[PDB]
Swiss-Prot record:
The keyword Signal applies. It comes from the Bacteria. Gene3D superfamilies: 2.120.10.10, 2.60.120.200, Intramolecular Trans-sialidase, Domain 3. The active site is at D232 (proton acceptor), E503, Y615 (nucleophile). This is Sialidase B. GO terms for cellular component: cytoplasm; intracellular membrane-bounded organelle; membrane. It comes from Streptococcus pneumoniae serotype 4 (strain ATCC BAA-334 / TIGR4). Keywords: Glycosidase, Hydrolase, Repeat, Signal. BNR repeats lie at residues 242-253, 424-435, 479-490, 528-539. GO terms for molecular function: exo-alpha-sialidase activity. Substrate binds at R207, R519, R581. Its EC number is 3.2.1.18.
Length: 658
């Protein structure tokens, strides 16, 4: 239905625009919708886009405002001192600033619903908050409202929260429009979603994107589908995949590459308040940090990820235990049975559960899905679900039976509580995935598994060699296969770091010459070089010209297929910031053929230096465009946890970058 007010092309240049006479006497009833299309590519630190206020002496705290911050945060205030109400609702990382050098038109829809007593904010087609209150306050029923303002809030006659930006369209309605109606408002988004809340994964959150271009032209993506908010393991996390057959324009409904079922796939709104935001699913098994590669010989797609048994993450993983027993140079998965104090069992060939104390097989076998069988019969456990109904996190049996898995909390036989690496493969380029297999230990019986570097593995162009980077304390540990991922060996490369999250990604500069770029603890991205297809590695150097935080962020990297300025080119994707995970860039490097040094010549700013940018994935699309799927928020910040739909995809051309 019709707007009660519609206006457009307002410039906000640190000077508010009064629209009181046009708008105020049109406001009626207690439910309102505001639709606003606006740009702000050089915002002030904190600025209001729209205000309704009592501008009179003594009523400073009687106003409604829609505001934003230069962090990309959006929100509203709804205040009335006489009613003793001061509502503030917001969500960080909700905005775009610029795309390809041009200011992005954001589409904001705020719904104020008196019947449901609920305030709801959408930006660019994404619901960023929905808040129900006991005492509802209609936005134009604030005591003494006498001003409607764009680009500030009028308090006691003065301009507060002055904005820099533009409002190209603003409309208001004397109605709380439905979610359906909202879905019909046209958008001008510079991005698309591949994985999103409410899709087939039923995870409300995602982290750790990957992208890889397959030989058929299909582009494949993997990701952590994270259920218990955005926390790393321990949690419930599955690995999901989606592909595009039209150069990234459209993407398939996701399927799982790796999943556990000890806990239900629940789409949950994780609390963001300071008291509860660190609530963590503590009894679920999970997968985390995936990586993809394609094998020329078999044609298979290979996907690796870390695996965590129930309640396990990096923080509490048994270090100094691989979880395997070594026997005659062969490694067998250890198991502990209900009631025992030690691990007295192993998993041998054909999944036979073997008793180590009495050196004989049992009537138990482990199938191909790491599920427990007794006499060929499937054992089961009861599934858990989570809720916050009690006012805090509970994990409780839900009445459903699922196959009993050795990675589960309720299992008869349980693996060592430490981290593993698993592998799965697809024979149809991402349409389905095999049951996962555990990789063996590479650094000994009594060393925990290395940590997979999320992103792409490396398929050497002139041989059948496949390489996956991993890391542990003191080194990068490259996993190398020459037989389609059937057998792996390691190649250790010392780095001058203890306890670094040394997430590494590789590019082949030329045949047999690999440069690996990796995260460090120094505030600088490091690199090392191999010239024998990964057998040996150079000492470590650093890139100047890009800054990271002390704790660092994953960097993604590819070798571009086409020459640029007549030179071989590498493209890096990373935040460029010493302060947080923000200031996303693609950095184009040109290779110097005389020494393989790289001149970082072009820096492309993905969005504003202050807008969030964290883990990232890049790939050269079949049409030579660049696809970027990235965390568009600060995934380190304790203030930006548990945000929906912030992993986003964009398409760029090389000319945009240069
Ligand atoms: N991938 C393991 C480290 C994730 S994070 O650096 O804490 O965001």
């Amino acid at each position: 239905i019709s707007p009660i007010f519609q206006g457009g092309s307002y410039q906000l240049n640190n000077k508010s625009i009064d629209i009181s006479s046009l708008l105020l006497d049109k406001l009626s009833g207690e439910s309102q919708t505001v639709v606003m299309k606006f740009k702000a590519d050089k915002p002030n630190s904190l600025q209001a886009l729209f205000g309704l206020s009592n501008s009179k002496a003594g009523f400073k705290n009687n106003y409604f405002s829609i505001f934003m911050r230069d962090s990309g945060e959006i929100g509203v205030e709804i205040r009335d001192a006489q009613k003793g109400i001061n509502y503030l609702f917001s969500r960080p990382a909700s905005l775009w600033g610029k795309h390809k050098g041009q200011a992005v038109e954001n589409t904001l829809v705020f719904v104020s619903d008196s019947k449901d007593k609920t305030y709801t904010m959408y930006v660019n087609g994404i619901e960023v908050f929905s808040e129900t209150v006991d005492t509802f306050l209609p936005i134009s029923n604030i005591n003494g409202i006498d001003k409607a303002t764009l680009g500030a809030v009028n308090r006691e006659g003065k301009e507060h929260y002055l904005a820099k930006g533009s409002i190209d369209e603003i409309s208001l309605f004397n109605k709380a429009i439905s979610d359906q109606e909202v879905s019909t408002i046209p958008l001008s988004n510079p991005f698309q979603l591949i994985f999103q809340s409410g899709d087939s994964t039923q995870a409300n959150y995602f982290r750790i994107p990957t992208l890889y271009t397959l030989s058929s032209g299909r582009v494949l993506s993997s990701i952590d589908a994270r259920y218990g908010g955005t926390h790393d393991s321990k949690s419930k996390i599955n690995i999901a995949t989606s592909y595009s057959d039209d150069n990234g324009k459209t993407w398939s409904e996701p399927i799982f590459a790796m999943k556990f079922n000890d806990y239900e796939e629940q789409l949950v709104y994780w609390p963001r308040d300071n008291k509860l935001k660190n609530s963590q699913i503590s009894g679920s098994a999970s997968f985390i940090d995936s990586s993809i590669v394609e094998d020329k010989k078999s044609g298979k797609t290979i996907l690796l990820a870390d695996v965590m048994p129930a309640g396990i993450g990096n923080n509490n993983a048994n270090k100094a235990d691989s979880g395997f027993k070594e026997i005659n140079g062969h490694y067998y998965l250890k198991l502990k049975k209900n009631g025992d104090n030690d691990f007295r069992y192993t998993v041998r060939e054909n999944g036979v559960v073997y008793n180590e104390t009495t050196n004989k097989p049992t009537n138990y076998t482990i199938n191909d899905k790491y599920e427990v069988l007794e006499g060929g019969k499937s054992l089961t456990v009861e599934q858990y679900s989570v809720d916050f109904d009690s006012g805090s996190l509970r994990e409780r049996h839900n009445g459903k039976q699922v196959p009993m898995n050795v990675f589960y909390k309720d299992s008869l036989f349980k693996v060592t509580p430490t981290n593993y690496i698993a592998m799965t493969t697809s024979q149809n380029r991402g349409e389905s995935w095999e049951q996962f297999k555990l990789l063996p230990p590479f650094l000994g019986e009594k060393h925990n598994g290395t940590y997979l570097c999320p992103g792409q593995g490396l398929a050497l162009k002139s041989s059948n060699r496949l390489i996956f980077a991993t890391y542990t304390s003191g080194e990068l540990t490259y996993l190398i296969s020459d037989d389609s991922g059937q057998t792996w060996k390691k190649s250790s490369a010392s780095i001058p770091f203890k306890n670094a999250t040394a997430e590494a990604q590789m590019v082949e500069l030329r045949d047999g010459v690999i440069r690996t770029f990796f995260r460090t603890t120094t505030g600088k991205i490091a690199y090392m070089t191999s010239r024998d297809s990964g057998e040996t590695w150079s000492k470590v150097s650093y890139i100047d010209g890009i800054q990271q935080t002390s704790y660092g962020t994953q960097v993604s990297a590819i070798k571009y297929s086409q020459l640029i300025d007549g030179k071989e080119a590498v493209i890096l994707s990373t935040p460029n910031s010493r302060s947080g995970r923000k200031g996303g860039q693609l950095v184009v490097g040109l290779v110097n053929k005389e020494d393989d040094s790289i001149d970082w010549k072009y820096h492309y700013d993905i969005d504003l230096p202050s807008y969030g940018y964290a883990y990232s994935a890049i790939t050269e699309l079949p049409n030579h465009h660049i696809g970027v799927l990235f965390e568009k928020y600060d995934s380190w910040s304790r203030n930006e946890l548990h945000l929906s739909n912030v992993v986003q995809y964009i398409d760029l051309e090389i000319n945009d970058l240069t």
